[PDB]
Design a protein around this ligand. Structure first.
Ligand SMILES: O=c1ccn([C@H]2C[C@H](O)[C@@H](COP(=O)(O)NP(=O)(O)OP(=O)(O)O)O2)c(=O)[nH]1
Ligand SMILES: O=c1ccn([C@H]2C[C@H](O)[C@@H](COP(=O)(O)NP(=O)(O)OP(=O)(O)O)O2)c(=O)[nH]1
Ligand SMILES: O=c1ccn([C@H]2C[C@H](O)[C@@H](COP(=O)(O)NP(=O)(O)OP(=O)(O)O)O2)c(=O)[nH]1
Ligand SMILES: [Mg+2]
Ligand SMILES: [Mg+2]
Ligand SMILES: [Mg+2]
Lengths: 142, 142, 142
């Protein structure tokens, strides 16, 4: 069968609407089958000295479904190789957000600056269900 | 209809029992409809010099349901604006925990101290299902 | 009843195949009933000066089920007491990965080195479902 047919085991898989605010970047994609995240691109060149942080545009906006959350995670390779991290990791993308996804990168290396180029894959976006809990206040209840 | 009626689409939404150990703080709340997290308050004033961390009381205890986990995430605005982060992010609140939720804040700015005041919203709490996995050890099995 | 019987409330609980690449370490375990994570051991001695990071072997490989993700989270006690963190937290373990789980530890204390010994519990592994989303590109759509 061709790929337009949804296989039985994927009947209930979730769709995510996405706008490329920067049409010159590829759509985010999973690096390998079954990978949890789609990789987000940087729309911009950024140089981070040790300890500096920047709010980096990804060129995309998404519509996370109600009842779900988008989560922006660092990539392990950049984290290990150069100390690149995300200040607010895991970044929380709410269902109602329609703005551009931005990544708060930070250089956690003590001495070597990190150069990010436009078109580099700088984070990964996961989508999960979340419990939109109803709080029940009690006076008292490992 | 009035708000006491659970709408059909919310019939299965999860309740979370909460004790305000500090009754002078508001209950945690979602900033907007559909937001993944409820914002946690600081019960205390804390000043963090660059690179310092503190274990900050939130004034609340919760009963995360069995089969779920509470997750303490940083807020993006403070992370970007002043470099505020959480050392153990995402903080993992277990179903059996009945103590006060505490937030391990850290100042990741190189030079500017962060002042947290009692009543500031310093983190956000998400609740998700988790797989309480049964390990199956094998000798061998992208 | 003896423990070999799956209780009714655990009928659908997920199994996780695991190989101890280092058979001298215990299998990861939950510290308490209902805890979200199983604690990962270090296979190695590592000393981290302030601001240094290391890619630490855990001695295990896992087979996260398709449709799920493994998540490597810091432990709160080490984070608060000595400033130990994980550069790429939450570390993302994909369903297709069959290599050794490695932990990117970092010392976020300003002045005191952290010593990790072989056999110390240095992180915790959670397993959750993830939405393997199908992107739907649109021109336009808190
Ligand atoms: O903490 C971690 C994170 C990942 N990993 C392994 C398993 C995971 O499936 C794999 C890739 O993780 P990332 O996608 O975060 N890394 P990166 O994107 O740099 O590499 P790749 O191009 O292979 O996806 O690395 C660890 O061992 N520990
Ligand atoms: O990494 C991130 C995190 C959040 N965001 C966007 C989407 C999310 O819905 C929105 C708000 O996230 P937070 O709740 O973490 N930020 P904060 O609480 O400071 O702002 P708000 O008062 O708007 O909730 O910011 C990003 O673009 N990148
Ligand atoms: O951010 C956090 C994380 C945890 N906690 C509490 C609730 C959680 O169930 C408990 C234990 O969390 P960890 O397992 O991350 N800590 P650690 O493994 O050091 O302690 P323990 O041996 O008790 O599990 O600490 C907080 O109050 N805030
Ligand atoms: Mg990857
Ligand atoms: Mg918010
Ligand atoms: Mg623990």
């Amino acid at each position: 069968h061709s790929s337009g047919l949804v296989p039985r085991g994927s009947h209930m898989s979730t769709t995510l609407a996405i706008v490329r605010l920067d049409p010159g970047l590829p759509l985010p994609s999973r690096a390998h089958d079954g990978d949890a995240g789609v990789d987000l691109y940087s729309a911009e060149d950024v140089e981070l000295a040790p300890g500096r942080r920047a709010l980096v545009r990804t060129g995309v906006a998404v519509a996370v479904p109600f009842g779900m959350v988008g989560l922006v995670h660092p990539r392990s390779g950049l984290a290990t190789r150069v100390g690149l991290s995300i200040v607010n990791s895991p970044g929380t993308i709410d269902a109602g957000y329609r703005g551009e996804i931005k990544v708060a990168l930070i250089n956690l290396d003590p001495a070597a600056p990190i150069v990010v180029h436009r078109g580099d894959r700088i984070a990964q976006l996961l989508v999960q269900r979340v419990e939109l809990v109803e709080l029940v206040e009690v006076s008292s209840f490992r």
